Amino acid sequence: AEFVPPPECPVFEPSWEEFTDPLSFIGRIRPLAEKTGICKIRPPKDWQPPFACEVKSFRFTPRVQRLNELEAMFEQAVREYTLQSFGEMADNFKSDYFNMPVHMVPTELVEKEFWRLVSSIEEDVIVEYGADISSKDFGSGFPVKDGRRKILPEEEEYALSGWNLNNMPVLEQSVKVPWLYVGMCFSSFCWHIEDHWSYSINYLHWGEPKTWYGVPSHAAEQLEEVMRELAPELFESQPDLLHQLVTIMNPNVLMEHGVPVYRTNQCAGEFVVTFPRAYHSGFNQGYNFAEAVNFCT
């Protein structure tokens, strides 16, 4: 039985007036978006930040991901890439896998095949993900008035924009920098919520889409119950922070157990916001570059 795509999460296309600052905007859309857990925000057409990473020196060692590791119950993350060599590897993998040019593969087919492979015992597909790359190391994808890189006049607006993830409020009231993600086809992240039940905001700088699944916070405990019922007994009793490292689950399984799930394809230039305690997971459609930070209101 092929994967059944969840219903689409809300997409907002704010006018220039509505696009003034993310905190007020998110506060206004909250009555709807908090009921879907995730939402997508498309900035105004002419809002186009230039990519500000130091591409020359950008070197990283991605983590190895075996899609079917859970159903199955010795390759190591030793390959260093540049942005360019990782992209060459990623495009070659996808075009060879589907036997067509990377841009011609329908998003629905990568989605269907991802979930098939995750549960397949007969085919072992292994991919790589440049995840947990700190923006402190090679710079943010957004221009920043840091002095490490030069900002042109046309760039300054973006260095100062409230939608530059480096300008999000990250301190919590009591008595953090953006992270970068270099994706390839089928690279993925399991179901999780954020430390402190924080919001997260996610920007796809460039590349092929990032496919998301989200669960509203009112269903958080229902998801956690389904996860405990169906998780391997050896992982059933693990603390949430550790269990979240292996909480891979087909969205249709959650949907069959009454958990509301919403999906979206995040395209280049679009934001995805996750709300407090909104479980989310996803996978990349192909070579892409994302930036994400947690924030509190």
Ligand X SMILES: Nc1cccc([C@@H](OCCN2CCCCC2)c2cc3nccc(C(=O)O)c3s2)c1
User: Does 200 count as an annotated binding residue?
Assistant: yes
Burial class, 30, CB count within 10 angstroms (exposed 0-12 / middle 13-18 / buried 19+): middle
User: Does 202 count as an annotated binding residue?
Assistant: yes
Residue 264 — φ and ψ, nearest 5°?
Answer: -160, 155
Member of 23, 29, 190, 268 binding ligand X (CB under 6 A): 190
Are 188 and 129 contacting, i.e. CB atoms less than 8 angstroms apart? yes
Under rule CB under 6 A, residue 133 binds ligand X: no
Under rule CB under 6 A, residue 58 binds ligand X: no
Under rule CB under 6 A, residue 137 binds ligand X: no
Q: Specify the stretch interacting with ligand X by CB under 6 A; choose among 9-17, 42-50, 127-135, 149-157.
A: 127-135
Three-class SS state of 227: helix
User: Does 81 count as an annotated binding residue?
Assistant: no
Distance from C-alpha of 185 to C-alpha of 284, rounded to nearest angstrom: 5
Under rule CB under 6 A, residue 289 binds ligand X: no
Q: Specify the stretch interacting with ligand X by CB under 6 A; choose among 47-55, 90-98, 126-134, 142-150.
A: 126-134
Under rule CB under 6 A, residue 189 binds ligand X: yes
Among residues 73, 71, 184, which one has the least CA distance to residue 118?
A: 71
Q: Specify the stretch interacting with ligand X by CB under 6 A; choose among 3-11, 47-55, 128-136, 168-176.
A: 128-136
Among residues 144, 183, 185, 181, which one has the least CA distance to residue 165?
A: 144
Q: Could you give the angle at the alpha carbon of 126 between the alpha carbons of 121 and 127, nearest 5°? A: 145
- Tell the smallest beta-carbon distance from residue 166 to ligand X (Å): 16
Q: 19 vs 189, which CB is nearer to ligand X?
A: 189
- Tell the smallest beta-carbon distance from residue 200 to ligand X (Å): 6
Site map (CB under 6 A) of ligand X, residues 204-223, x = contact? ------x-------------
List Cα–Cα distances, 186 to 8, 113, 152, 173, 224, in angstroms: 20, 9, 36, 38, 24
Site map (CB under 6 A) of ligand X, residues 152-181, x = contact? ---------------------------x-x
Among residues 273, 141, 196, 219, which one has the least CA distance to residue 227?
A: 219
Are 116 and 56 contacting, i.e. CB atoms less than 8 angstroms apart? no
Under rule CB under 6 A, residue 186 binds ligand X: no
Binding site residues, ligand X, CB under 6 A: 129, 131-132, 179, 181, 189-190, 200, 202, 210, 290, 292
